[PDB]
Amino acid sequence: AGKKVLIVYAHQEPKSFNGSLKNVAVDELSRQGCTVTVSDLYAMNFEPRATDKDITGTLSNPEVFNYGVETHEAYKQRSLASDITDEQKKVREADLVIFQFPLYWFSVPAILKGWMDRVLCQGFAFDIPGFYDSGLLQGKLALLSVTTGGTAEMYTKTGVNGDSRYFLWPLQHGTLHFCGFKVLAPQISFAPEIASEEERKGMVAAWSQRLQTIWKEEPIPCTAHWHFGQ
């Protein structure tokens, strides 16, 4: 109150553990009086590919297609495809953006990668030059809520997967920080599929409990040191 939250959600199945985490987020933030909007990417059949269809009308150089250039020019000339601009409006209005997704290959599912690629365009999310703290979304908070197959033990420095902080870098630092977001600590729900039906309840409740005081949190220091150092 008054805050707007966007949840960008990437799971195929409403009954999934990801689905429950998104639904608990909506319930709790709605209870607090927050304005809440969900981009359900799979349900939207959201387009992940960066193509020339992302620019309507005619191209600033139709001899050689350079996605970054064309989308930058399209943004400034209000000529982007409406799926993209619809998302940009939600992001522009949001105080907090939560990404809710299963880890796919130490990263976001391709549908959500496509949302980052196509929604966070130069002119909108950053300029060249125009980034990290010179980055256009400054003032906003972002938070990754990730589920994994691997256990917390696997996700340690000398575990097989390495520290979870290591896979966070391209998302938190290369993407969210670059665009100016302040980054709240990741929520990581380790290994729901190997249960139990009570540790699972416990993970959902912990996320619900944490959303209670989310506006009280300070952002992480989004540095090489936080991700890799001691």
Ligand X SMILES: Cc1cc(=O)[nH]c2c3c(ccc12)OCO3
Ligand Y SMILES: Cc1cc2nc3c(=O)[nH]c(=O)nc-3n(C[C@H](O)[C@H](O)[C@H](O)COP(=O)(O)OP(=O)(O)OC[C@H]3O[C@@H](n4cnc5c(N)ncnc54)[C@H](O)[C@@H]3O)c2cc1C
Known binding-site residue numbers for Zn(2+): 173, 177, 222
Query: Which residues, including other chains, have CB under 8 Å from residue 108's CB and lie 6 or more apart?
Result: 10, 99, 101, 116, 171
Whether 18 contacts 110, CB under 8 Å:
no
Residue 173 binds Zn ion, judged by CB under 5 A: yes
Which residues participate in the annotated binding site for FAD?
11, 17-20, 103-106, 147-150, 155, 193, 200
Contact positions with ligand Y (CB under 6 A) in 92-131: 102-106, 117
What is the rounded distance in angstroms from the CA atom of residue 139 to the CA atom of residue 196?
Answer: 39
Judged by CB under 6 A, which stretch of 35-43, 130-138, 143-151, 219-227 contacts ligand Y? 143-151
Going by C-alpha positions, the residue among 109, 117, 110 that lies closest to residue 16 is 109
What is the rounded distance in angstroms from the CA atom of residue 91 to the CA atom of residue 27?
Answer: 20
Residue 202 binds ligand Y, judged by CB under 6 A: no
Going by C-alpha positions, the residue among 192, 119, 113, 111 that lies closest to residue 150 is 192
Query: What is the separation, in whole angstroms, between the first and last Cα of the chain?
Result: 37
Judged by CB under 5 A, which stretch of 61-69, 78-86, 151-159, 171-179 contacts Zn ion? 171-179
Residue 202 binds ligand X, judged by CB under 6 A: no
In the complex, minimum distance from the CB of residue 71 to ligand Y, in angstroms, rounded to a whole number: 7
The conformational region for residue 212 under phi > 0 = left, psi -120 to 50 = alpha, else beta, is alpha
Q: Which residue is nearest to Zn ion (CB)?
A: 222
Contact positions with ligand X (CB under 6 A) in 53-72: 68
User: Which residues on adjacent β-strands are paired with residue 40?
Assistant: 9
**Interacting residue ranges for ligand Y, rule: CB under 6 A:** 11, 13, 15-18, 20, 50, 64, 66-68, 102-106, 117, 147-150, 174, 192-193, 197, 200-201, 204
Binding site for Zn ion (CB under 5 A): 173, 177, 222
What are the residues binding ligand X (CB under 6 A)? 68, 106, 122, 128, 149-150, 154, 161, 174, 178
